[PDB]
Amino acid sequence: MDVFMKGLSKAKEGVVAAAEKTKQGVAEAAGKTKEGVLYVGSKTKEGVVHGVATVAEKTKEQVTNVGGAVVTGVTAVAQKTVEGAGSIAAATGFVK
Amino acid sequence: MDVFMKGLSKAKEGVVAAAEKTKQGVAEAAGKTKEGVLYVGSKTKEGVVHGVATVAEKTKEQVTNVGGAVVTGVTAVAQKTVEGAGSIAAATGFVK
Amino acid sequence: MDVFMKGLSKAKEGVVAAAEKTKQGVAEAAGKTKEGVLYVGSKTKEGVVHGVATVAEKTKEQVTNVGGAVVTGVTAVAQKTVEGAGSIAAATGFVK
Amino acid sequence: MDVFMKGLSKAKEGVVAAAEKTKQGVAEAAGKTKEGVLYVGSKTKEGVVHGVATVAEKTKEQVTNVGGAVVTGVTAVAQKTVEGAGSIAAATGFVK
Amino acid sequence: MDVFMKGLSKAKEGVVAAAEKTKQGVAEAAGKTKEGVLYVGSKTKEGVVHGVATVAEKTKEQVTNVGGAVVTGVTAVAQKTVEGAGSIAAATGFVK
Amino acid sequence: MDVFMKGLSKAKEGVVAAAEKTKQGVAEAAGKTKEGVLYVGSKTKEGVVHGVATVAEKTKEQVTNVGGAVVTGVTAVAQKTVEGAGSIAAATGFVK
Ligand SMILES: *[C@@H]1O[C@H](CO)[C@@H](O)[C@H](O)[C@H]1NC(C)=O
Ligand SMILES: *[C@@H]1O[C@H](CO)[C@@H](O)[C@H](O)[C@H]1NC(C)=O
Ligand SMILES: *[C@@H]1O[C@H](CO)[C@@H](O)[C@H](O)[C@H]1NC(C)=O
Ligand SMILES: *[C@@H]1O[C@H](CO)[C@@H](O)[C@H](O)[C@H]1NC(C)=O
Ligand SMILES: *[C@@H]1O[C@H](CO)[C@@H](O)[C@H](O)[C@H]1NC(C)=O
Ligand SMILES: *[C@@H]1O[C@H](CO)[C@@H](O)[C@H](O)[C@H]1NC(C)=O
């Protein structure tokens, strides 16, 4: 009995790394439990409406680089070691 | 019995790293439990409406670099070690 | 019985690192428990409306660098070690 | 040699009647005459851009009439007579 | 040699009647004459940009009439007579 | 040689009637004459930018009439007669 959007339950030694560049309209998390209930002579209505995110959106990204090195975007790195060596490189630029 | 958006439950030795550049309209977290209830002769209405995020949004990013190195964006790094060595590099620029 | 937006429950030795550049319309956290209740001859209405974030937003970022190194954005780093050495570098610029 | 948007030229005994409920983006009137001109070694650019009128427009008109007579809209009437009689009726409501 | 938006030229005995409920973004009137000109070694740029009128406009008109007569809108009437009789009625309501 | 927005030129016995309920962003009237000019080694830029009228405008008109007669809007009437009779009625309400 549990509901998650991005989580974890009943875990040992957890390592989590995350990153987002998102535009979410509705990220609603709902747990609806309905037990032991009676409806003699009744009208019931439940709803979730218009989960729109964006309209008429204009986005422009221009990158002009001459003899250089730039980093743009989203990056996530996670690493665990009991013993040893971990050599990890992401989005690196070496210029000579 | 629990609801999460981005969390964790019943965990030992947890390491979490996160980062966002988001534009969320509605991030509502709801737990609706309904037990032991009667509705003789009644009208019930429940709703969540218009979870819009943005309209008519204009975003522009211009990067002009000459002989350099710049860092833009979102980055998250998490690392755990019992014993040993961890060499991790992200979004690095070496120029000579 | 609990609801979280970004939190954690019943954990030992927790390390959390986070950072945001967000524009959230509604980040409401709601726990609605309804037990032992009667509605003979009644009208009930519950709602959450118009969770809009932004309209007509204009954002511009211009970066012009000549022979340099600048850092822009959101970065989060978390690291835990029992014994050993951790060498972590993020968004670094070396120029000679 | 002349340019008009809604006008008249070299006329005798003119009668004009007009009415609008318009939403025009660009109603620009341009007369561009280019004579006796030289362009040795040159770059020339001329332009008209983004003549947008409206975005994300919401318009609602509700008319609820019980046993009545209402007038809505745009009406234009023009009449000329040398001799005689002119009987003209527009958008009339007779109730008994 | 002349430019008009809504006018008249070289006319005798003119009668004009007009009425508007407009929302114009740009109603610019331009006369550009370019004669006897030289451009050795030059760059020329001419432009008109972003003639937008409206964004995110919300307009609502509700008319609720019971046993009556109302007049809404734009009306223009023009009439000329040398001799005689002119009977003109517009947007009239007779109730008995 | 002349530019008009709403006017008249070289006319005899003119009758004009007008009325507006407008919201104009830019109603600029420009006459640009360029003759006898030289541009050796030069850069020329001319422009008109951002003729926006309105953003995020909300307008509401509610008319509730019971057994009456009201007049709303814009009306313009013009009439000329050499000899005779002119009977003109606009937006009239007769109740008995
Ligand atoms: C780890 O990675 C680095 C570069 O990030 C590399 O030079 C090295 O050899 C790797 N190994 C160890 C044991 O450091
Ligand atoms: C760790 O990473 C660095 C660079 O970040 C590298 O020079 C080194 O060799 C790696 N290993 C150790 C044991 O330091
Ligand atoms: C740790 O990282 C640094 C650079 O941040 C590196 O020079 C070094 O070798 C790494 N290891 C140790 C044990 O310091
Ligand atoms: C003119 O029109 C009216 C109604 O508008 C009508 O009663 C009449 O007979 C018409 N003729 C004359 C000559 O008035
Ligand atoms: C003119 O119009 C009126 C109503 O507006 C009408 O009663 C009349 O007969 C018409 N003619 C003359 C000559 O008045
Ligand atoms: C003029 O119009 C009126 C009403 O406005 C009408 O009663 C009349 O008969 C018309 N004619 C003359 C000659 O007055």
Q: Three-state SS string across chain B, please?
A: CCECCCCEEEEEEEEEEEEECCCCCECCEEEEEEEEEECCCEEEEEEEECCCCEECCEEEEEEEEECCCCEEEEEEEEEEECCCEEEEEECCEEEC
The CA dihedral of B2, B5, B8, B10, to the nearest 10 degrees, is 0
* Residue F9, strand partner residues: E9
* Residue C43, SS3 per DSSP: strand
Q: Of D63, F23, F60, nearest to E60 (Cα)?
A: F60
The sheet carrying A42-49 orders its strands as: A42-49, B42-49, C42-49
E56 contact C CB<8A: yes
Q: What are phi and psi of B67, to 5 degrees?
A: 60, 45
C-alpha to C-alpha distance for D37 and D44, rounded to whole angstroms: 12
Provide the residue type at E68 as one letter: G
A49 contact C CB<8A: no
Burial label, A60 (beta-carbon count in 10 A; 0-12, 13-18, 19+): exposed
| D85 CA from centroid of ligand 4 (Å) | 8
| Pairing label, strands E93-95, D93-95 | parallel
Which are the residues after which chain B is interrupted (C to N > 2.5 Å)?
none
The CA dihedral of B75, B81, B84, B87, to the nearest 10 degrees, is 0
Ligand 4 atom nearest to D85, measured from its CA: 13
Residue D40 DSSP one-character state: T
* Residue F79, strand partner residues: E79
Residue A34 tokens read as 């309905």
Residue B30 tokens read as 């709801």
> B15, A14: Cβ pair inside 8 Å?
yes
Q: Give the CB-side neighbour count of residue E65, counting CA atoms within 13 A.
A: 22
* Residue A95, SS3 per DSSP: strand
Residues B69/A68, Cβ–Cβ less than 8 Å: yes
C-alpha to C-alpha distance for F42 and E10, rounded to whole angstroms: 42
Q: What are phi and psi of B85, to 5 degrees?
A: -135, 135
Please provide the size of chain F in residues. 96
C-alpha to C-alpha distance for E61 and E69, rounded to whole angstroms: 16
Residue E4 tokens read as 């008009």
Q: Of C39, B30, C47, C43, nearest to A37 (Cα)?
A: C39
| B75 CA from centroid of ligand 3 (Å) | 20
Residue B81 tokens read as 């070690």
F91 contact D CB<8A: yes
C-alpha to C-alpha distance for A23 and F20, rounded to whole angstroms: 43
CA A77 to chain centre: 15
Residues B53/B44, Cβ–Cβ less than 8 Å: no
Residues E17/F18, Cβ–Cβ less than 8 Å: yes
Cα angle vertex C80, ends C75, C86, to 5°?
80
Nearest CA in chain B to A28: B28
Tell me the technique behind this structure: cryo-EM
C56 contact F CB<8A: yes
Residue B1 tokens read as 């019995």
Residues D83/E83, Cβ–Cβ less than 8 Å: yes
C-alpha to C-alpha distance for B18 and B76, rounded to whole angstroms: 6
Provide the residue type at D88 as one letter: I
Residue F81 tokens read as 């007669």
Residues F10/D11, Cβ–Cβ less than 8 Å: no
C-alpha to C-alpha distance for C66 and B69, rounded to whole angstroms: 9
C-alpha to C-alpha distance for F73 and E63, rounded to whole angstroms: 13
* Radius of gyration, CA atoms only, chain E: 24
Q: Is the CB of A5 under 6 A from ligand 1?
A: no
Q: What are phi and psi of E59, to 5 degrees?
A: -135, 130
* Residue F32, SS3 per DSSP: strand
Provide the residue type at C83 as one letter: E
Residue carrying structure tokens 């008429």? A56
Residues B54/B23, Cβ–Cβ less than 8 Å: yes
Task: Tell me whether residue C50 is annotated as binding.
Answer: yes
Q: Whose CA is nearest to atom 9 of ligand 5?
A: E87
C-alpha to C-alpha distance for D25 and D51, rounded to whole angstroms: 6
Q: Which residues contact E45 (CB under 8 A, 6 or more apart)?
A: D44, D45, D46, F44, F45, F46, F47
Query: Per-residue b/e over D52-67, b at no fewer than 16 CB within 10 Å?
Result: bbbbbeeeeeeeebee
| Pairing label, strands D42-49, E42-49 | parallel
Q: Of B69, B36, B38, nearest to A69 (Cα)?
A: B69
Q: Is the CB of A72 under 6 A from ligand 1?
A: no
Q: What are phi and psi of D51, to 5 degrees?
A: -90, 40
C-alpha to C-alpha distance for E80 and D14, rounded to whole angstroms: 10
Q: Do chains A and F touch (3 or more CB pairs under 8 A)?
A: no
Query: Per-residue b/e over A2-19, b at no fewer than 16 CB within 10 Å?
Result: eebbbbbeebeebbbbbb
Q: Of B23, B4, C54, nearest to A28 (Cα)?
A: B4
Nearest CA in chain D to A54: D56
Distances (CA, A) of E37 to B95, C77, D43, D57, E48: 52, 65, 15, 46, 22
Residue C3 DSSP one-character state: B
C-alpha to C-alpha distance for C30 and A95, rounded to whole angstroms: 52
C-alpha to C-alpha distance for B92 and A77, rounded to whole angstroms: 14
C-alpha to C-alpha distance for E62 and E90, rounded to whole angstroms: 23
Task: Tell me whether residue F2 is annotated as binding.
Answer: yes
Residue carrying structure tokens 């640009």? F32
C-alpha to C-alpha distance for A56 and B57, rounded to whole angstroms: 7
| B82 CA from centroid of ligand 3 (Å) | 17
Nearest CA in chain A to D55: A56
C-alpha to C-alpha distance for B6 and E58, rounded to whole angstroms: 37
Residues F28/E24, Cβ–Cβ less than 8 Å: no
C-alpha to C-alpha distance for A16 and A77, rounded to whole angstroms: 9
Residues F85/E85, Cβ–Cβ less than 8 Å: yes
Three-state SS annotation for chain E? CCECCCCEEEEEEEEEEEEECCCCCECCEEEEEEEEEECCCEEEEEEEECCCCEECCEEEEEEEEECCCCEEEEEEEEEEECCCEEEEEECCEEEC
Please provide the size of chain C in residues. 96
Q: Of E56, A61, B23, E4, nearest to C26 (Cα)?
A: B23
Q: Is the CB of C66 under 6 A from ligand 3?
A: no
Q: Is the CB of B85 under 6 A from ligand 2?
A: yes
> E4, D5: Cβ pair inside 8 Å?
yes
* Residue E59, strand partner residues: D59, F59
The Cα of E26 is separated from the nearest Cα of chain D by a number of Å equal to 5
C-alpha to C-alpha distance for B30 and F63, rounded to whole angstroms: 41
C-alpha to C-alpha distance for C75 and A75, rounded to whole angstroms: 10
Cα angle vertex A14, ends A9, A15, to 5°?
130
Residues C31/B32, Cβ–Cβ less than 8 Å: no
Query: Largest Cα–Cα distance in chain B?
Result: 81
**Cβ pairs D/F, distance under 8 A:** 3
Q: Which residues contact E67 (CB under 8 A, 6 or more apart)?
A: D66, D67, D68, E95, F66, F67
Which runs of E-coded beta strand occur in F3-82?
Answer: 8-20, 29-38, 42-49, 54-55, 58-66, 71-81
C-alpha to C-alpha distance for B55 and A55, rounded to whole angstroms: 5
Q: Give the CB-side neighbour count of residue F28, counting CA atoms within 13 A.
A: 20
* Radius of gyration, CA atoms only, chain D: 24
* Residue D52, SS3 per DSSP: coil
Angular region, B12: left φ>0, alpha ψ -120 to 50, beta rest: beta
- Which residues in chain C are contacts of E55 at CB distance < 8 A? 56
Q: Give the CB-side neighbour count of residue C64, counting CA atoms within 13 A.
A: 1
C-alpha to C-alpha distance for F38 and F47, rounded to whole angstroms: 20
